[PDB]
Amino acid sequence: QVQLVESGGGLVQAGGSLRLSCAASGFPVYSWNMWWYRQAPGKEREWVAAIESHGDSTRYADSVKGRFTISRDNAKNTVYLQMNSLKPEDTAVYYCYVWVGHTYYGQGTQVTVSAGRAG
Amino acid sequence: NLCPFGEVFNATRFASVYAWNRKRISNCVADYSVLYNSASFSTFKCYGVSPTKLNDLCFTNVYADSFVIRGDEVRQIAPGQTGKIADYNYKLPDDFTGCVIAWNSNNLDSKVGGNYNYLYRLFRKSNLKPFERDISTEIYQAGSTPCNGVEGFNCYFPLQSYGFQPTNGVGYQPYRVVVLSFELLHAPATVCGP
Ligand SMILES: *[C@@H]1O[C@H](CO)[C@@H](O)[C@H](O)[C@H]1NC(C)=O
Known part of the structure; x- marks a missing residue:
C-alpha cells in the first residue's frame, strides 16, 4: 500500500546542484511530517532536513543550511530536496522518512560530488 | 516511608504527551526541597505555592503527571497557555496549584534515525x-x-x-516534563514534607 520511491540522485561536480525526489504512494505527503537523512560509507546516518505536516515549516542541519531546500508538489504527491552548491563531502546515499503509524523509508538515492579536471 | 517520586522522575520511558501518565502520590513523606534544588531540572516553576515552602505543607493527594514534548513547547505547560500542546494534549487550569518541572532528555529519548x-x-x-x-x-x-x-x-x-x-536544534529536542498538583480534600492530608 504505502511506499516512498526516490529519484534524482547521480553524479555532479562541486558547486553544481541536484533535485532529489521523494514520491509517495498510499498517503498524501502534505498530511505527514517528513525527514531527510543521508549516509556516507563508514559514517552514521545523518539527519539533513525536515518538513512539518499540514504546513510549510522546515528545518535543516547546520551542514546544509542555506544550500538545501525542501518543497512539496502536492499534485505529484512528491517532496523534493533541492541541493545547491554541492561539495564533495555531500557525497552519500540520501533517504526520505515518513511516519504513518510507523516509519516508512525511501529506497535511497546516491549522490556523488566530483572535483577536478577531466581533460 | 518516602514518597516514590523516583519511579516518576527516573522512569526508563515516558509517555507521549497526548497519552500522558499520572501517578497518585499518597500517605508518604516527600522532600520537595531536594528536587527543587537539583540543577538537573532546568524548569521548576510553581503556581499558587512557593517551592521553598512545600516541605511545610500537607496534602490529601499529590498527582505527578509526566510526558515528553519538544523544547519549544515547554512554555505551553503553564496556566493561560494556548497552542497545539496546551489546546490538544495537556492543559493546566487557569488557577493551577502545583509545579512544572522539565529537563532536556535528548540523551534518553532521541535515537539515530x-x-x-x-x-x-x-x-x-x-x-x-x-x-x-x-x-x-x-x-x-x-x-x-x-x-x-x-x-x-x-x-x-x-x-x-x-x-x-539527536542532532535536532534544542527547540526540537525532547524534554521530560513532570507536573505536580497538590490536592487538599475533606479527607485527611497524608502527603507531608519532612
Ligand atoms: C533518580 O536517580 C538519581 C540517580 O540514580 C538519584 O540521585 C535520585 O535521587 C533519583 N530520584 C529522583 C526523584 O531524582
Missing part, C-alpha cells in the same frame, strides 16, 4: 479541559464533509510523531 515512539495530537474538535486526557484516534473532520472513519480529503489521522533525532 529518529525515535518515533513519542507522539502528539495535532487536531481536535475542541480544546481540552484542564487535566483532560484524550487518547482517541478517530479521523479528524477538518472540512465540511464527514469522514466516516476513513482518511481522505480534509479527513486526518489526528496524531503525529516527533521523530526525535
